[PDB]
Amino acid sequence: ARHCGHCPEEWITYSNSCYYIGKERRTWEESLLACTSKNSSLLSIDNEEEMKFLSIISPSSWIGVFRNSSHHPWVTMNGLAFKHEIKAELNCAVLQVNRLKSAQCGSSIIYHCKHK
């Protein structure tokens, strides 16, 4: 009952990077915590081609992209200006069917974790 040695047990390998699939209802805050309690980061979107994949795996997820107030630029974890289109009191983004959306950071959504 053997899995890949570059990632943990119940994890999936796509493109040089492991993922954790959620199945748990949690909040952006906690979602970021839980991932970091697993030695990895919260799900970051690389290419508009990873994005098609990621919807056929599990369709809703918090992404490592947030604003501070309503009116500030959208930022990754790095603190870098996020470079993908992302759609009042909503400040954390989510992935939903191959588009990025703005959501209430208190909404209990599904989180996926990501590696290197």
Partner: protein, 121 residues
């Protein structure tokens, strides 16, 4: 254990989930040319990560008249408690899985999304 680029990797298996809609016949060959077989299932947990999924996928399972029964690609037995309606499927037609467990017996000349499967060394 490692996989191909557009391929997903779970429990040292390389899976290829489909972008496109193709024939049951066609898809088999298409897996073969990428050196994999059409998805043969172990159990419900062999596609757990894909739980949510709402598409329906072609699987490597037909009914031939050697055994008057549903056999896989290899020609192994169908676990008679994997698919509940195993005594309902129209022999003329082919099966199509979905990671919620459910199956659909369906016209083989019809066009669906599909899965290929690799494995060990």
């Amino acid at each position: 254990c490692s996989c191909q680029e557009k391929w997903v990797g779970y429990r040292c298996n390389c899976y290829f989930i489909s972008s496109e809609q193709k024939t049951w016949n066609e898809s088999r060959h298409l897996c073969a040319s990428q050196k994999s077989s059409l998805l043969q299932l172990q159990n419900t947990d062999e596609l757990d990560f894909m739980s949510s999924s709402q598409q329906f996928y072609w699987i490597g399972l037909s009914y031939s008249e050697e055994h008057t029964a549903w056999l896989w690609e290899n020609g192994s037995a169908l676990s008679q408690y994997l698919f509940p309606s195993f005594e309902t499927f129209n022999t003329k037609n082919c099966i199509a899985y979905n990671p919620n467990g459910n199956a659909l017996d369906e016209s083989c000349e019809d066009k669906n999304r599909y899965i290929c499967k690799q494995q060990l060394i």
